[PDB]
């Protein structure tokens, strides 16, 4: 029959590990680095565009930062295609919650569902897992600013500052070195760019190789606001923080 | 790999054979039938002193006149017992009478070979055979007291006495001699207790061993620790008596 | 590499399908059976090996009828043959139900052909272990056909398959030459009984039992029937004679 | 419109003695004001010393008796030709009937 | 790892061996065929080899009548050829019923080619060891020749050849067109276009044919038919009286 | 039908529900509580078709309790009522629709305000100072329209209510065997066990 | 669609996928549960492979199934969720149909069943999880503590632990827990728990979390300090000798 | 029967590679070169018509397909795969957009839909990834002109200009030189033909080349008149003659 | 070799064999011997019942399918239950729908076609049991031999199981004689018991180890065990 070509993507190793998840992660480890730092008055998402050219249209490109809700956004590390499938179901989920309760979906609730979807491709169906890791940056009126992370395994955790993708080990060490609870968004923004700048496999950290987003509470309002920086906005901030 | 319903060159079903192996590793279970009733005994076997030994259920009631003992991967036996109880109850609902012990057994055995990845014959949904055997003991107006051994193979036999589990081969050999058609219930009780003691690594007390029986008058009952302890004591005395 | 012969729908590097070829082996190892197309019908005959005195004589009939005008005989795995006939009966019944006219022989051939060819398209099925000689009389005369495990089939003047297939083919070829104007039903029956006796030499170990059936416009009215009683004993004699 | 039910008349009687029992029924089968048969048995011996009769709509009545007799047959297969007790038959018949609770056997059955 | 040679999945070189081997199977029959376009007709010639004497020569063919207008010749094993034929016939009957007009030759080719493309991607379907040559006189495109292979590829041709000696036949035809400068046989009658076909088939293969060595199909405005041993003989006799 | 009354005062919501349960010719019970607590600070009263009534209430209860356990949090009164509306709105186009009408009284511990929601079997939801299902409003609304004040005390509320219940005992044809009253406030849900002469 | 038998027998009568599932448990953080004379306590350790998490939001180890029953575990986190959800749902359903909250034993028998089912069903792998379920049966004050494993087997314990180094901490418990006299105080019970964890946690004030369950739906999780205090009073016990 | 290939045929290797996708990409590198150039007032996609037989009729086979009246597509890799992808693309543009909103989808979105179809063939049971890479060029009222590339993995990215297939490396380099943000459509077409020349071995003419553009609206190609807001398709495939006239000023 | 072609029944060996079926066939040889034979008035089944311990019971080898048909098994007890149950249904269906007793030859065809389905499709497994079917129908007494390969045959007599070849020779030898034992069931049975005893070795046939079944003209299919078969030992 067919059993002959069945890779058996959902089984335990003799050590009790999930092969495909392990391998999926190994895949993720080569993806452009993504960092998420949570300040006291906001959150920051920074990602490095993997592979670029003079011709690559940047104003139209969005390979790592996607808006899920008006208060939640994610940074992707891994297969962009796999990411989108997951992204979209998440966007639907947020709207169903809103349609049912008339309240925006609490950040963890959305993260747990998406993680559960992933967990599934891990326990049944003979399909490969999604080669993606997410950094969720969102805000709700129950836990305020939150920063999460989920990977192919289907597990997720909360963080003050974190990175996914390539050179995480280095990036983590550096964040764990300069992160302070009292940090202000702009402090976080600066720390984020510094970290990438030091972990890049590239020569210099130019704007054309970056994607940036912030979820702050524009004081002159009383409500929270998501902002995905545009090529020029990233180019500006890059000069100011002293990376020119 | 190799289909879960494949035949060996010797004409045996692999999965079933291996199944039988897991059963040999199971805790000892013994049953003795006598014209006064049937006795069912088992080896608890706690994997630690912190484990509350009476939360170990290896002898369960199918119906008031039918009980059984298990050996092997005991988790597997849960659904078997569900089916069994539902069969006994259902038969009563549809016929206003008690289900014969043999039929109850035949019913359980019928689930046995209901495994595979797509076996042509119906819709056998269950990825593997059960890894547990059962000694079904009961009484009915047709064939009185009966003891049955049902295996994951789907077959079953009727015995006057039968031992399954790690100590079986030896215990069975013993039974071959100890058993005679004129045994009394009490005699059977001691005999079971004795054989369990011989094959059990553990010094048999009323906490790592459990007795039970099924008789026409009171049906299936599981002996409480106190009751068994005394039978254990009563046994030590008679033994050291010669 | 190798192993192109373990799965059924696999093309070997030289374009073959060994599983089908192995099926043929089961066929060649079977009893010999033939078909002779006469000038107004068809005759079928088959070798029945007497494994022991214990077999009730004349009782384990091999030749089967489809509808009322078709005759089928096969060599190889009998159960596989019955299976194919059952499908044929369904196939003919379906056809008649919608078009009223009993299924034409050529149409029937393609129904079986398409069906048998289907069992060479997937690895979840085993090809048929039989070659089948079949035919009948319809609106356009007699038609004789032989179907291969591969699904291949053509129209024949004479056809043979099985253990003694070579002898048969030799003898059939002779008839073709010595009768450029056609053979009669009555004569094909005799000539058929002879060929079976001759072809029985490549199996001369076990004693056998002859079985013949025919479908003639003038002898059976176009309806398939078994040759029995006198006309049968008669052909047995014509054969027993020419074998000495 | 199509009415799936009919009435074939008939009348049956069941009386129980201390060590015996009787089930009787006329042998006339009808349709409106016409007689379909002056002799069409209505009471049947179903084995294991059980007599049965499903009176009313004959198609349904025959269906039931047939279905019950078959139930007896399998009872023997499944339980070693064990005799089906009258009480058990009764409970079994209850399930046969209630099984069609929402499109019943239009008959008054007695065993 | 090495099973990338047993099912339709990629090999490290980006290849699909099973598709390649399917192509291999198309020559099993050891029969060549070619098709050409006339001024307003289309002809397909195919060799016919019936060696067994016990066969009824008339029941042997690799040319099919898909519809009143589409004709299909197959290079490959008869069981797969017949599977393809049946399907195309169904696809044509259906197309007419749904869209109200006769399915065009090129469209039927595309539809069949797409079906093949699938066996190329889905793992449980094996490709068919056949190459289908569809011909007709489209009510919009005129004489048409469209052929499809186990790879799911297809395209239209001025003329085409298929089989073991496909190359010999092809270059012969190429030459003829390089010469004539036109994309068809400038002949009003199909009998002549048929003769042209058989003639060049002979030149390229360096073989003479009898009336039982060939199989011929002709497509004209509103009708595709095949010739008989005799219709052929007449055609053969004609070319003889030119040499 | 049954009396299902609701009135939102300053710091709580009061729900009055008739106690009688009549089945044809006989009144089977006179102490029936047509209510279900969906969460510590959310209460739902109901009336309608025989089986559907409780089946729906309990179904909603079960689900809201599951949401509480899972998120370790109590959904706002608004959120609960939205969920309840969605469910009734579905039923409306189902094979056999739930014929139930409900009042939802809750105290939003985050907003620190009491809220009253009225929803019918069609999934028609509206938030009100006071409301009722069935005919109850026909006799009582004129009283409430007159004396209701947003800053009323729970005591004034229970008074204006008693006033309403009297008009119902005067002009309504059926004997509903009085009402059972309940208050939902910052501290939860409690039953005014003495309204049979308050 | 996909129904390949992933859990099957091998020659020696083993079902490796279930065994490898257990391996996943051994690698998981440690979990322990000890029952007192009128309470049950559950403790779990916190990995340190990375530290810069947000303890407020990061999902904790002890989960509530109903107001009177909790479940902690050792093994794959993604897997535990599915079991917790199914358990929570069955909890409400039991209240809705039987009009009575589940007994701790029942909720256990249910969770165990789900696990067993995933060992003899096609197209699925066993849960790489072992659990500790504890609480008080409705209108009863006798503490209940149970454990389940990937195989689907379960039983009750006076005290038990699962996860890495569980071998160690169990030993500790076997020679520190007397059924004759169980920790008669929530405090003395939470002490024995923290003591057992310290045998393996290697000084982890923030690496140790505790949750106490008292009769009648009284479940509360301690905070660092409360726990840190226990740790202290304990390290002195050592030095004072 | 019954497809029992319910499991993934593309899985993760210990190195974290997804073999089938890699191989698919390989198949793309082997393919004939095709490119795209975005100008300020248009886009151009082109490739070589590598006739597989002198007897074949290159026109009967188009490698440059119209998806919507303002979106075109071209590829490199497996022709058959691309063909079905084109039918699916044309359909999804309707079922998932035009039938809901009454207007054709915007380039990025259609590209996204196409990408999803491919992504699935990367994870769904019993199938292999598509052995092709596409270059989709279109225009929509709110995003103007755009050019995208979609890979066998389901990934896609926006370009100013790029190439895929056989001579992608070389071609991409020649484009990086000649491209700027001030090109007019005619220039991109010129640069297009020049770039393609290097990749072409033998005959280079309007019959061996296929080139289309997304530019102004073609009322003359609408088919009807009387609806002011409907001005014509922006997609236009050049004719053999149109190509040659240009090759002269090459 | 074989190792590469015996993983299932959907695979032919290079010589055209189906090992999974052949393996199934082995399960029968490993089974307990059972004999079948018939005259013109009766059909008889004789079977040797096997036990586990001396504390166990003996496995039943004969099953009744209808009042005019029954069989004996050799091999997988469960499979015999499955097949005999299917044969009971067929007998039943023939009666309810056509008020017609199912012909032995017909039953044979149905069994054949059912067995064959598990030898050509992925997932299934051949049945691992042999069956001897006897029955008296409109054309008299009959005896059929059913093999898991699907091959069903009508014989005057035969035997299957371990050492079965013994009896089969005896029958093949006695043929002309027993086939004429009409109007005398007791004899036909003694002839059956004598045949089966030619396959003994380990022990001698006792009262709780011998199983006999008979069917005929005015004889509904009936089974004899224990004291019932005493008069034949």
From Swiss-Prot, chain B:
The modification Phosphoserine is found at residue 48. SMART domains: Proteasome_A_N (SM00948). The modification Phosphothreonine is found at residue 47. Pfam families: Proteasome, Proteasome_A_N. GO terms for biological process: proteasomal ubiquitin-independent protein catabolic process; proteasome-mediated ubiquitin-dependent protein catabolic process. Present with 17100 molecules/cell in log phase SD medium. This is Proteasome subunit alpha type-5. It comes from Saccharomyces cerevisiae (strain ATCC 204508 / S288c) (Baker's yeast). The gene is PUP2.
From Swiss-Prot, chain C:
Its main location: cytoplasm. It is found in: Cytoplasm; Nucleus. Keywords: Acetylation, Cytoplasm, Nucleus, Proteasome. One of its GO terms (molecular function) is mRNA binding. The alpha and beta forms are probably products of the same gene with different post-translational modifications. GO terms for biological process: proteasomal ubiquitin-independent protein catabolic process; proteasome-mediated ubiquitin-dependent protein catabolic process. The keyword Nucleus applies. The keyword Nucleus applies. Disulfide bonds: none annotated. GO terms for cellular component: nucleus; proteasome complex; proteasome core complex, alpha-subunit complex; proteasome storage granule. Belongs to the peptidase T1A family. The proteasome degrades poly-ubiquitinated proteins in the cytoplasm and in the nucleus. It is essential for the regulated turnover of proteins and for the removal of misfolded proteins. The proteasome is a multicatalytic proteinase complex that is characterized by its ability to cleave peptides with Arg, Phe, Tyr, Leu, and Glu adjacent to the leaving group at neutral or slightly basic pH. It has an ATP-dependent proteolytic activity. Present with 12000 molecules/cell in log phase SD medium. This is Probable proteasome subunit alpha type-7. It comes from Saccharomyces cerevisiae (strain ATCC 204508 / S288c) (Baker's yeast).
Swiss-Prot record, chain F:
One of its GO terms (molecular function) is endopeptidase activator activity. It comes from the Eukaryota. It is found in: Cytoplasm; Nucleus. GO terms for biological process: proteasomal ubiquitin-independent protein catabolic process; proteasome-mediated ubiquitin-dependent protein catabolic process. One of its GO terms (cellular component) is cytosol. The modification Phosphoserine is found at residue 76. Keywords: Acetylation, Cytoplasm, Nucleus, Phosphoprotein, Proteasome. Pfam families: Proteasome. InterPro entries: Ntn_hydrolases_N, Proteasome_beta2, Proteasome_bsu_CS, Proteasome_sua/b, Proteasome_suB-type. Signal peptide: none annotated. The modification N-acetylmethionine is found at residue 1. Present with 21800 molecules/cell in log phase SD medium. Non-catalytic component of the proteasome which degrades poly-ubiquitinated proteins in the cytoplasm and in the nucleus. It is essential for the regulated turnover of proteins and for the removal of misfolded proteins. The proteasome is a multicatalytic proteinase complex that is characterized by its ability to cleave peptides with Arg, Phe, Tyr, Leu, and Glu adjacent to the leaving group at neutral or slightly basic pH. It has an ATP-dependent proteolytic activity. This subunit has a chymotrypsin-like activity. Belongs to the peptidase T1B family. This is Proteasome subunit beta type-4. It comes from Saccharomyces cerevisiae (strain ATCC 204508 / S288c).
Swiss-Prot record, chain G:
The modification Phosphothreonine is found at residue 58. SUPFAM superfamilies: N-terminal nucleophile aminohydrolases (Ntn hydrolases) (SSF56235). The keyword Ion transport does not apply. This is Proteasome subunit alpha type-4. The proteasome degrades poly-ubiquitinated proteins in the cytoplasm and in the nucleus. It is essential for the regulated turnover of proteins and for the removal of misfolded proteins. The proteasome is a multicatalytic proteinase complex that is characterized by its ability to cleave peptides with Arg, Phe, Tyr, Leu, and Glu adjacent to the leaving group at neutral or slightly basic pH. It has an ATP-dependent proteolytic activity. The keyword Glycoprotein does not apply. Pfam families: Proteasome (PF00227), Proteasome_A_N (PF10584). CDD domains: proteasome_alpha_type_7 (cd03755). The 26S proteasome consists of a 20S proteasome core and two 19S regulatory subunits. The 20S proteasome core is composed of 28 subunits that are arranged in four stacked rings, resulting in a barrel-shaped structure. The two end rings are each formed by seven alpha subunits, and the two central rings are each formed by seven beta subunits. The catalytic chamber with the active sites is on the inside of the barrel. Interacts with CIC1. Belongs to the peptidase T1A family. The gene is PRE6. Gene3D superfamilies: Glutamine Phosphoribosylpyrophosphate, subunit 1, domain 1. Its main location: cytoplasm. PANTHER family: PROTEASOME SUBUNIT ALPHA/BETA. It is found in: Cytoplasm; Nucleus.
């Amino acid at each position: 029959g067919s059993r002959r070509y069945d890779s058996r993507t959902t089984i335990f190793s003799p050590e009790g590990r999930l092969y495909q998840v392990e391998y999926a992660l190994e895949s993720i480890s080569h993806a452009g680095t993504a960092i998420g730092i949570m300040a006291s008055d906001g959150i920051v998402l920074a990602a490095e565009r993997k592979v670029t050219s003079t011709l690559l249209e940047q104003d139209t490109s969005t390979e790592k930062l996607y808006k899920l809700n008006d208060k939640i956004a994610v940074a992707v590390a891994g297969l962009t295609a796999d990411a989108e499938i997951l992204i979209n179901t998440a966007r639907i989920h947020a709207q169903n919650y809103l349609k049912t309760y008339n309240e925006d979906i609490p950040v963890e609730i959305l993260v747990r569902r998406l993680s559960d979807i992933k967990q599934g491709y891990t326990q049944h169906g003979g399909l490969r897992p999604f080669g993606v890791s997410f950094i969720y940056a969102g805000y709700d009126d129950r836990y305020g600013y939150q920063l999460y992370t989920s990977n192919p395994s289907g597990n997720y955790t909360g963080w003050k500052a974190i990175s996914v993708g390539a050179n995480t080990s280095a990036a983590q060490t550096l964040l764990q070195m300069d992160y302070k609870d009292d940090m202000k968004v702009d402090d976080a923004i600066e720390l984020a760019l510094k970290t990438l700048s030091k972990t890049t496999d590239s020569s210099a950290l130019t704007y054309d190789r970056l994607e940036f987003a912030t979820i702050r509470k524009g004081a002159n309002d009383g409500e929270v606001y998501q902002k995905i920086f545009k090529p020029q906005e990233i180019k500006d901030i890059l000069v100011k923080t002293g990376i020119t | 790999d190799r289909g879960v319903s494949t035949f060996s060159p010797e004409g045996r079903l692999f999965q079933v054979e291996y199944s039988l192996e897991a059963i040999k590793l199971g805790s000892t279970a013994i049953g003795i039938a006598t014209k006064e009733g049937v006795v069912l005994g088992v080896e608890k076997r706690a994997t630690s002193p912190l484990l509350e030994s009476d939360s170990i259920e290896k002898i369960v009631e199918i119906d008031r006149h039918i009980g059984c003992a298990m050996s092997g991967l005991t988790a597997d036996a849960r659904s078997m017992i569900e089916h069994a109880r539902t069969a006994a109850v259902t038969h009563n609902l549809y016929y206003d009478e008690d289900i014969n012990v043999e039929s109850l057994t035949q019913s359980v055995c019928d689930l046995a070979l209901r495994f595979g990845e797509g076996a042509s014959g119906e819709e056998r949904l269950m990825s593997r055979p059960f890894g547990v055997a059962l000694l079904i003991a009961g009484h009915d107006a047709d064939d009185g007291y009966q003891l049955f051994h049902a295996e994951p193979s789907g077959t079953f036999y009727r015995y006057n006495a039968k031992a399954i589990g790690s100590g079986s081969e030896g215990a069975q050999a013993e039974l071959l001699n100890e058993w005679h058609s004129s045994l009394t219930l009490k005699e059977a009780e001691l005999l079971v207790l004795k054989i369990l003691k011989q094959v059990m690594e553990e010094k048999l007390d009323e906490n790592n061993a459990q007795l039970s029986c099924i008789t026409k008058q009171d049906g299936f009952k599981i002996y409480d620790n106190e009751k068994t302890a005394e039978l254990i004591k009563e046994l030590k005395e008679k033994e050291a008596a010669e | 590499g190798t192993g192109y012969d373990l799965s059924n729908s696999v093309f070997s590097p030289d374009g073959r399908n060994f599983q089908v070829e192995y099926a043929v082996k089961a066929v060649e190892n079977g009893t010999t059976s033939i078909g002779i197309k006469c000038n107004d019908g068809v005759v079928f005959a088959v070798e029945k090996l007497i494994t022991s005195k214990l077999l009730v004589p004349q009782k384990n009939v091999k030749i089967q009828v489809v509808d009322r005008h078709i005759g089928c005989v096969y060599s190889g795995l009998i159960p596989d043959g019955r299976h194919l006939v059952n499908r044929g009966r369904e196939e003919a019944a379906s056809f008649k139900k919608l078009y009223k006219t009993p299924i034409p022989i050529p149409a029937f051939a393609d129904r079986l052909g398409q069906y048998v060819q289907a069992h060479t398209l997937y690895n979840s099925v085993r090809p048929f272990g039989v070659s089948t000689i079949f035919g009948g009389v319809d609106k356009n005369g007699a038609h004789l056909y032989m179907l291969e495990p591969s699904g291949s089939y053509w129209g024949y003047k004479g056809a043979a398959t099985g253990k003694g297939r070579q002898s048969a083919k030799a003898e059939l070829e002779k008839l073709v030459d010595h009768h450029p104007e056609g053979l009669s039903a009555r004569e094909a029956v005799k000539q058929a009984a002879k060929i079976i006796y001759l072809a029985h030499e490549d199996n001369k170990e076990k004693d056998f039992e002859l079985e013949i059936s025919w479908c003639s416009l003038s002898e059976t009215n176009g309806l398939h029937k078994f040759v029995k009683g006198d006309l049968l004993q008669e052909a047995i004699d014509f054969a027993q004679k020419e074998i000495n | 419109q199509f009415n799936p039910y009919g009435d074939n008349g008939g009348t049956i009687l069941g009386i129980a003695g201390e060590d015996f029992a009787v089930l009787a029924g006329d042998t006339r089968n009808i349709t409106d004001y016409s007689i379909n048969s002056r002799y069409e048995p209505k009471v049947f011996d179903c084995g294991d010393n059980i007599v049965m009769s499903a009176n009313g709509f004959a198609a349904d009545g025959d269906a039931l008796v047939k279905r019950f007799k078959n139930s007896v047959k399998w009872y023997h297969f499944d339980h070693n030709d064990k005799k089906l007790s009258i009480n058990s038959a009764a409970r079994n018949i209850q399930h046969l009937l209630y099984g069609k609770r929402f499109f019943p056997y239009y008959v008054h059955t007695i065993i | 790892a090495g099973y990338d040679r047993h099912i339709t999945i990629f090999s490290p070189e980006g290849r699909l061996y099973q598709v390649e081997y399917a192509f291999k199977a198309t020559n099993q029959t050891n029969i060549n065929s070619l098709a050409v376009r006339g001024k307003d007709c289309t002809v397909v010639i195919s060799q016919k080899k019936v060696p067994d004497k016990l066969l009824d020569p008339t029941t042997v063919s690799y040319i099919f009548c898909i519809s009143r207008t589409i004709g299909m010749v197959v290079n490959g094993p008869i069981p797969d050829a017949r599977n393809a034929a049946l399907r195309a016939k169904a696809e044509a009957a259906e197309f007419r019923y749904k869209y109200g007009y006769d399915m065009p030759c090129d469209v039927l080719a595309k539809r069949m080619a797409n079906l093949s493309q699938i066996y190329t991607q889905r793992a449980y379907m094996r490709p068919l060891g056949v190459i289908l040559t569809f011909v007709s006189v489209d009510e919009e495109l005129g004489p048409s020749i469209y052929k499809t292979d186990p790879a799911g590829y297809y395209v239209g041709y001025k003329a085409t050849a298929t089989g073991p000696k496909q190359q010999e036949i092809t270059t012969n035809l190429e030459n003829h067109f390089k010469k004539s400068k036109i994309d068809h046989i400038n002949e009003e009658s199909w009998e002549k276009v048929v003769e042209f076909a058989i003639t060049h088939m002979i030149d390229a293969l360096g073989t003479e044919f009898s009336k039982n060595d060939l199989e011929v199909g002709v497509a004209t405005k509103d009708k595709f038919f095949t010739l008989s041993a005799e219709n052929i003989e007449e055609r053969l006799v004609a070319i003889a009286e030119q040499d | 039908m049954d009396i299902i009354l609701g009135i939102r005062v300053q710091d709580s919501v009061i729900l009055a529900s008739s106690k009688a349960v009549t089945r044809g010719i006989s009144v089977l019970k006179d102490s029936d509580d047509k209510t279900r607590q969906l969460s510590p600070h959310t209460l739902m009263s109901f009336a309608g078709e025989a089986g559907d009534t409780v089946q729906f209430a309990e179904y909603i209860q079960a689900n809201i309790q599951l949401y509480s356990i899972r998120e370790d949090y109590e959904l706002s009164p608004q959120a609960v009522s939205s969920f309840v509306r969605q469910e009734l709105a579905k039923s409306i186009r189902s094979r056999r629709p739930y014929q139930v009408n409900v009042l939802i009284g809750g105290y939003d511990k985050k907003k620190n305000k009491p809220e009253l929601y009225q929803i019918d079997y069609l999934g028609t939801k509206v938030e009100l100072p006071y409301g009722a299902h069935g005919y109850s409003g026909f006799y009582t609304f004129s009283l409430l329209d007159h004396h209701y004040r947003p800053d009323m005390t729970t005591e004034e509320g229970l008074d204006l209510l008693k006033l309403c219940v009297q008009e119902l005992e005067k002009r309504m044809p059926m004997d509903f065997k009085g009402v059972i009253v309940k208050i939902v406030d910052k501290d939860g849900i409690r039953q005014v066990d003495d309204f049979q002469a308050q | 669609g996909y129904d390949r038998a992933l859990s099957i027998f091998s020659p020696d009568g083993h079902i490796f996928q279930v065994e490898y599932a257990l391996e996943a448990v051994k690698r998981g953080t440690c979990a322990v549960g000890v029952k007192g004379k009128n309470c049950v306590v559950l403790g779990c350790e916190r990995r340190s492979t990375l530290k810069l998490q947000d303890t407020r939001i990061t999902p904790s180890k002890v989960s509530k199934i109903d107001s009177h029953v909790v479940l902690s575990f050792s093994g794959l986190n993604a897997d535990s969720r599915i079991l917790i959800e199914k358990a929570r749902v069955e909890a409400q359903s039991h209240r809705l149909t039987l009009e009575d909250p589940v007994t701790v034993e029942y909720l256990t028998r249910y969770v165990a069943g789900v696990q067993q089912r995933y060992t003899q069903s096609g197209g699925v792998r066993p849960f790489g999880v072992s659990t500790l379920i504890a609480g008080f049966d409705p209108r009863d004050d006798e503490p209940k503590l149970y454990q389940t494993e990937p195989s689907g087997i379960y039983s009750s314990w006076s005290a038990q632990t699962i996860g890495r180094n569980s071998k160690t901490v169990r030993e500790f418990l076997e020679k520190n827990y007397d059924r004759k006299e169980p920790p008669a105080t929530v405090e003395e019970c939470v002490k024995l728990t923290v003591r057992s964890l310290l045998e393996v946690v290697q000084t982890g004030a923030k690496n140790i979390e505790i949750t106490v369950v008292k009769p009648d739906s009284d479940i509360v999780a301690l905070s660092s300090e409360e726990i840190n205090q226990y740790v202290t009073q304990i390290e002195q016990e050592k030095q004072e000798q | 029967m019954t497809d029992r290939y319910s499991f993934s045929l593309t899985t993760f290797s210990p190195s974290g590679k997804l073999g089938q996708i890699d191989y698919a990409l390989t198949a793309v590198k082997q393919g004939v070169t095709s490119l795209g150039i975005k100008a300020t007032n248009g886009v151009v996609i082109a490739t070589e018509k590598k006739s597989s037989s002198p007897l074949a009729m290159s026109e009967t086979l188009s490698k440059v397909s119209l998806l919507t009246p303002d979106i075109g597509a071209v590829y490199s890799g497996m022709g058959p795969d691309y063909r079905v992808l084109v039918d699916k693309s044309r359909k999804v543009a309707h079922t998932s957009y035009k039938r809901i909103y009454g207007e054709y989808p915007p380039t990025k979105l259609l590209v996204s839909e196409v990408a999803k179809i491919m992504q699935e063939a990367t994870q769904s049971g019993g199938v292999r990834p598509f052995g092709v890479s596409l270059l989709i060029a279109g225009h929509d009222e709110f995003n103007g002109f755009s050019l995208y590339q979609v890979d066998p993995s389901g990934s896609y990215f926006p370009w100013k200009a790029t190439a895929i297939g056989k001579g992608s490396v070389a071609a991409k380099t020649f484009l990086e030189k000649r491209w700027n943000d001030e090109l007019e459509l005619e220039d991109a077409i010129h640069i297009a033909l020049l770039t393609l020349k290097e990749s072409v071995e033998g005959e280079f003419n309007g019959d061996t080349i296929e080139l289309a553009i997304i530019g102004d609206e073609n009322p003359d190609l609408l088919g009807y008149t009387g609806i002011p807001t409907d001005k014509g398709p922006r997609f236009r495939k050049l004719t053999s003659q149109e190509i040659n006239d240009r090759l002269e000023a090459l | 070799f074989r190792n590469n072609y015996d993983g299932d029944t959907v695979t032919f060996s290079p010589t055209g064999r189906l090992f999974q079926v052949e393996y199934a066939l082995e399960a029968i040889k490993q089974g307990s011997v059972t004999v079948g034979l018939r005259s013109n008035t009766h059909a008889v089944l004789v079977a040797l019942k096997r036990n586990a311990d001396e504390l166990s019971s003996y496995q039943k080898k004969i099953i009744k399918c209808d009042e005019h048909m029954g069989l004996s098994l050799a091999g997988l007890a469960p499979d015999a239950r499955v097949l005999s149950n299917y044969l009971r249904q067929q007998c039943n269906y023939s009666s309810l729908v056509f008020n017609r007793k199912l012909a032995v030859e017909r039953a044979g065809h149905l069994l054949c076609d059912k067995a064959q389905k598990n030898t050509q499709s992925y997932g299934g497994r051949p049945y691992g049991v042999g069956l001897l079917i006897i029955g008296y129908d409109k054309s008299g007494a009959h005896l059929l031999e059913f093999q898991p390969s699907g091959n069903v045959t009508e014989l005057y007599g035969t035997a299957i199981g371990a050492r079965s070849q013994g009896a089969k020779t005896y029958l093949e030898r006695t043929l002309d004689t027993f086939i004429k034992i009409d109007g005398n069931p007791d004899e036909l049975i003694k002839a059956g018991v004598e045949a089966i005893s030619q396959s003994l070795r380990d022990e001698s046939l006792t009262v709780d180890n011998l199983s006999i079944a008979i069917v005929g003209k005015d004889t509904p299919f009936t089974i004899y065990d224990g004291e019932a078969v005493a008069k034949y030992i």
